[PDB]
């Protein structure tokens, strides 16, 4: 990955990326994109020097995006869920969908609908945890029940054993770096096995995934530009548009629009989908519209805290008004409400930013800038 | 409708690993004693113990976190250090001293000062140790220490900032080491035969010095 090249190169304390004399130079555009993406992960600072998080990424051998989740996962014993997640995306999708099954027989399609339903319990609006559901469920399937479990759920078996092996090695990598006994850690199956994540753990789990794909966050069009596209209750979920954060504003805003995939859990929702959705990537597949590979839904304040580390988030001046006094401690310390802005700056009309809900937060003047510390 | 209407955020492994320098690297290892005190209570003090113990166990069991009980069969108060609750190693001894002060004759609230602080001691001595007084001579000495209506004893208590229990010819003084000492000379001076009035004058002098410092 071009981000790993710059990341390893920056951990080498090498300042000039763009003009470096590579024997085989990567194109300047990707090198620039890598720096911005690697900044979005909070590993480079605003002057493009490696931070403490970035140095840990240099130690991790995976892609810098998958470097980020594991590092920030060391809280509330949610690691096995993240490891189970990261293994699934790394290998691929274990779900044989209805279109692949050619069932888009009425009794067979109906079994396919239940099989998805049992794995849908973790979260209504999210697909990445349905991946978690099968991976964790696989651990409790005995050896003699695999193929029956495989055939019953329309899942790919040989892919599944891969996930279990990938979970094993991956846990060793993060434990080695995070744990003080780096080399001495030995992985065990019991560690991988775990029970249902709690609601707080689920929310804790959605925001960890955001730490990786903070750039890949999409807003409903009806939020950012009311009436730009006609949205109403009768519209199906797959036809509800969304806009990426860093999409360049076209003369016609419909070009930037991106839509949910039918296979996603959100399609069978019926109710209105999330105002923000987190997507692994976008796919031109499907002549009608560009589709999402959606992972999980994030709220306003959760998104703000994740992009707080990154440079994709900007804060306004202190708010004043009814019950909005800005408490001040020192010349370089204060407590007030601020409306965070995620994405492009208001001045920057090329890229498409938006404003988040106002939240209590702590700032300190560093280098003449009220750097944010923590949300109150 | 009213008719007035309008219109939260973010087993030891049995093996070793050898590192590049050849060193071994192992896994992390897996991640107040019971004591008792006996103090017997004499007969004359137990009725005070009965009606007062409603205020004696709470500080011991709560603040000192001691395990309290008494033996009716042996007529003794018992305190034990509970290993799973007790935290202060000195609490058990501290509780014993507080019980002892009540046993010697001090008031309960007076004895609580032993629990509240760590620097209170009981000084004890006897009249014949000062001077061999017998018959009426001994009785007059005891009266001189107490004074009319106990005024002389209270004068010493307030001036030297201590307490005195005058049990017949048996004297106990409770307070800080220097404070209890100051009381002794005033008591002893009375035993040797100093009139109470002259003694009272010296109490006023030392009391002023106490306030100054």
């Amino acid at each position: 990955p071009v981000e790993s090249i710059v990341l390893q190169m920056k951990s080498m304390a090498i300042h000039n990326i763009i003009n470096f004399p590579f024997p085989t130079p990567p194109d300047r555009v990707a090198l620039s994109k890598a720096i911005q993406l690697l900044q979005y992960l909070g590993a480079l600072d605003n002057k493009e020097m490696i931070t403490e998080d970035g140095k840990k990424m240099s130690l991790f051998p995976l892609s810098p995006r998958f470097s980020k989740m594991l590092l920030v996962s060391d809280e509330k014993a949610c690691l096995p869920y993240i490891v189970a997640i990261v293994s699934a995306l790394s290998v691929g999708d274990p779900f044989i969908n209805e279109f692949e099954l050619g069932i888009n027989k009425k009794e067979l399609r109906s079994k396919f609908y239940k099989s998805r339903s049992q794995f849908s319990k973790l979260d209504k609006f999210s697909d990445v945890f349905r991946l978690l559901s099968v991976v964790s469920a696989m651990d409790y399937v005995p050896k003699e029940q695999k193929e029956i479990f495989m055939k019953k759920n329309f899942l790919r078996g040989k892919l599944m054993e891969e996930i279990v092996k990938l979970r094993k090695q991956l846990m060793y990598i993060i434990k080695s770096n995070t744990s003080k006994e780096n080399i001495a850690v030995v992985i065990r199956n019991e560690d991988l096995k775990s029970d249902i994540p709690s609601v707080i753990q689920i929310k804790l789990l959605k925001q960890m995934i955001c730490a990786g794909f903070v750039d890949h966050v999409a807003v409903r069009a009806d939020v950012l530009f009311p009436d730009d596209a006609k949205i109403t209750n009768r519209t199906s979920i797959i036809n509800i548009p969304y806009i990426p954060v860093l999409a360049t504003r076209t003369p016609n805003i419909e070009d930037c629009f991106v839509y949910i995939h039918p296979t996603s859990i959100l399609n069978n929702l019926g109710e209105m989908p999330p105002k923000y959705m987190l997507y692994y990537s976008l796919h031109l597949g499907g002549n009608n519209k560009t589709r999402m590979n959606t992972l999980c839904d994030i709220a306003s304040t959760p998104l703000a805290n994740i992009a707080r580390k990154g440079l994709l988030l900007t804060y306004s001046k202190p708010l004043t008004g009814q019950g909005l006094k800005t408490v001040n401690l020192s010349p370089t310390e204060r407590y007030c409400y601020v409306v965070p802005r995620f994405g492009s700056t208001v001045d920057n009309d090329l890229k498409i930013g938006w404003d988040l809900n106002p939240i209590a937060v702590h700032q300190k003047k560093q280098k003449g800038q009220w750097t944010v510390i923590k949300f109150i | 409708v009213a008719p007035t209407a309008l219109k939260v955020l973010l087993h030891e492994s049995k093996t070793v690993v050898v590192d590049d320098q050849g060193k071994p690297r192992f896994t992390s290892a897996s991640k107040i004693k019971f004591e008792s005190r006996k103090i017997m209570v004499p007969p004359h003090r137990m009725t005070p113990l009965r009606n007062s113990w409603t205020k004696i166990y709470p500080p011991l069991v709560e603040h000192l976190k001691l395990q309290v009980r008494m033996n009716l069969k042996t007529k003794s108060v018992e305190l034990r250090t509970n290993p799973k609750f007790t935290t202060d190693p000195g609490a058990l001894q501290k509780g014993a001293d507080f019980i002892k002060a009540f046993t010697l004759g001090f008031d309960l609230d007076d004895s609580i000062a032993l629990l509240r602080l760590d620097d209170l001691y009981i000084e004890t001595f006897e009249v014949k140790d000062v001077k061999t007084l017998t018959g009426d001579h001994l009785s007059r000495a005891i009266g001189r220490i107490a004074g009319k209506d106990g005024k002389t004893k209270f004068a010493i208590e307030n001036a030297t900032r201590t307490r005195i229990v005058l049990a017949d010819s048996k004297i106990h003084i409770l307070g800080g080491f220097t404070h209890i000492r100051m009381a002794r000379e005033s008591v002893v001076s009375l035993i040797l035969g100093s009139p109470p009035g002259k003694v009272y004058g010296n109490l006023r002098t030392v009391a002023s010095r106490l306030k100054e410092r």
Binding site: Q118, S136, A137, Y140 | Y57, Q67, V68, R69
Partner: peptide, 13 residues
């Protein structure tokens, strides 16, 4: 699986 009286008069107190 899911994925699929005076205190202490005579006694210790």
């Amino acid at each position: 699986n899911p994925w699929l009286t005076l205190p202490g008069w005579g006694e210790w107190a």
